[model samples]
Target: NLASSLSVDAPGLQNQIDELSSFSDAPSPSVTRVLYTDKDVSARRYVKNLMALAGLTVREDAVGNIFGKWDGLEPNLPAVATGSHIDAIPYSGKYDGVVGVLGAIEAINVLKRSGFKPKRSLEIILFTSAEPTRFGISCLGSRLLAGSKELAEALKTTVVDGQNVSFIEAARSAGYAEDKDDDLSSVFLKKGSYFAFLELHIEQGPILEDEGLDIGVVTAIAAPASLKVEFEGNGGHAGAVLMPYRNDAGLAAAELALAVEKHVLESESIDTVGTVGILELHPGAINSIPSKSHLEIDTRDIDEARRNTVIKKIQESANTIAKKRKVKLSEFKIVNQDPPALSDKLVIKKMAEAATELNLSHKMMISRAYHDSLFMARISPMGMIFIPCYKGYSHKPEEYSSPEDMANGVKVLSLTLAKLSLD
Candidate 1:
């Protein structure tokens, strides 16, 4: 009965969810809990309490990575890590990141109450800045751990008061400090350090619901290549700037947006996608022709060659469009170009087994929107369990997932961990 008798504390999980959602920059019924912010700090304190009551040895690293360890029966074994971030996007929903954190906690509680002692320890990870809103890029926690992003360089890259500032300085200003003795830069886990890592998360989309399935066994994670596009031109009076006689920066930008998508669709790459998430026109006025345009593009794909090819095409073609329209365009600024990560085969099998044992329909899925699990894959055998969100909605206040669905995901997570840790 060690692992088989597990049961999630549904009410307690819900209470934590409600409390965390309350600490948001946005008004009630909305969440804006970005990392290193006031709300993020408050939520971190609350989450620390939850980690403590679970009887885990909790500590925070210098760079704000939180860990809660449930020491196993075999204390020398490498730990099995599991967790997700708590930082929410602007006006995002309550369930996106917190679901996994709370679910993992509930799963651990059930394991203890059922008298389960793991062969491998469980390390609960509370990652920082999974959402890019605070620092204009995502995956700060896992990236640092994977050595994909250097801590010192990233800290100094943050801007403040029109000058570059250190992330540690900003973090202390927001009232966060390391509570452990481990050197922050040297603490990132390497491959073979942990037995395996698992994450239970909301699908953040409606694929599971639409397919009438209870869970999604992730097959791969699609990471994005973040890029920015800028268009510059002269402004004039609305009436004075006639068509063909005008340098319309806004029109050129709109065309560039279409071209970006068009090229991606025409490419030979499979499962490739592109988006222009940011668009700006300077000197906004009904009476004036804008002089400048700026837009940020997000292009993602599982194939690295295809992703890069599309980016090159966009870069080459956008300038041509700008010239044809008599506007100035700057070269694309490459913000982040990350490779996609595939799920560990063993972990995928375990998730499938978990779903099958529960008599729930499940399938392997590729995630278009990357999660922390993506970066975790870099150094560990990692997999993800996803239950459907209400509709294909997230990053909005209306995002929701059923309590029953959330509990089902926890069940699968618990079962997966039990088998992985004790088998």
Candidate 2:
């Protein structure tokens, strides 16, 4: 009866997504809502307003993790939690993280329309700074919640966006409690604080759409390790410095980049992947020999040991390249290193049941792109439901999901939440 009574407002969800997308700083169609910025702050207010309209008791943590709770019959019991992030990388499309957030709210509305009340409270979280564009750290809010002592300690004096601006300064400027409080213990979630956590998201890859699947029941999330590497050398005019005398930092970076590719290929697994998404050369000019180069390496795999091995190979390669190119390996900092998260069997079963009830085609899959669910899983049981986006595109301007696909995802999400709350 709950399944049949569930009503998802596809058009409504789409409209809200569009409205939220407007809060970005970039031009229309390309979202750029980095953490603690005015645009991001405005977007948070809009989401909180929508949460209030859904009749949930809304609150926020010191770091601005927005939580909206729909109380249940047993208010004291651990709640069923669901959510995703809204912060987008520069020029990203609208639907990557937006779908999970707006769709969760719609899912709750569907339950409310069906006159469904839960035995356990259902909570929605809009995590702060899910994207690493601003702070170079992904899942910032959820990382703290999952008791990442390393990240908490790093935030105390960590600068943001290559500027002198500190994380605490940025957080406090957004009217958060970071200025007065140095201890982040209040933000940490104890083990099993939530009964379960579910995130509805886009596949962020081409597999589901290519295979014609309606929903993806995520089995595991690939672990990601990000490293910041800096190469330093003496600077001179390109034409003035002879090839033998020049110690080019830029060339060292290029060699290391190729090394990453080579080692990933050596892993011999299609699942092993690495990317040098960021590269910057100092005094960037056609006529100047670069004095310094900075690059960020992102590598991931389902297997922790394999991924770590690749990282190790890359580090060794960097050292060799630095020595050969006569550039100093100035700094190598680990932004974050996380293990893969496996879905809970009970939660996966519930999602599959919900999908079956809706007659939606579903397949078990792995999430290569990590999300807030990855860290939330550290605190409690967690799983993710993925809907197909256009050509499996994400983090870009062309990213999209059909209305029908979104509605179907919401239906499954509503039923799954219902069943989980009852449990």
TM-score of each: 0.90, 0.98
Candidate 2 error regions (>4 Å): none
lDDT against true structure, model 1: 0.82
Q: What does candidate 2's lDDT look like per residue over 1-423, in tens digits?
A: 888888888788889989999998899989999899899889999999989999989999888999999999999999999999999999999998888889998998999999998999999999987889887989999999999887777787555566767888888888885545657668899999899999999998888789988999998999999999999999899998888898999999999999999999999999999999999999999999999999999999999999999998988998999999999999988777899999999999999999999889999999999999999999999999999888878888999998888999999889999999999
lDDT by residue for model 1 (178-283), tens: 3334335554676788788898888877899999999999988886898878888888899876777888989988998998989889876668999887788878
Candidate models: Cα lDDT each: 0.82, 0.91
Error of 1 at 152 (Å): 4.6
Listed per model in order, the count of residue pairs whose N, CA or C atoms clash below 3 Å is: 0, 1
Candidate 2 local Cα displacement, residue 46, angstroms: 0.7
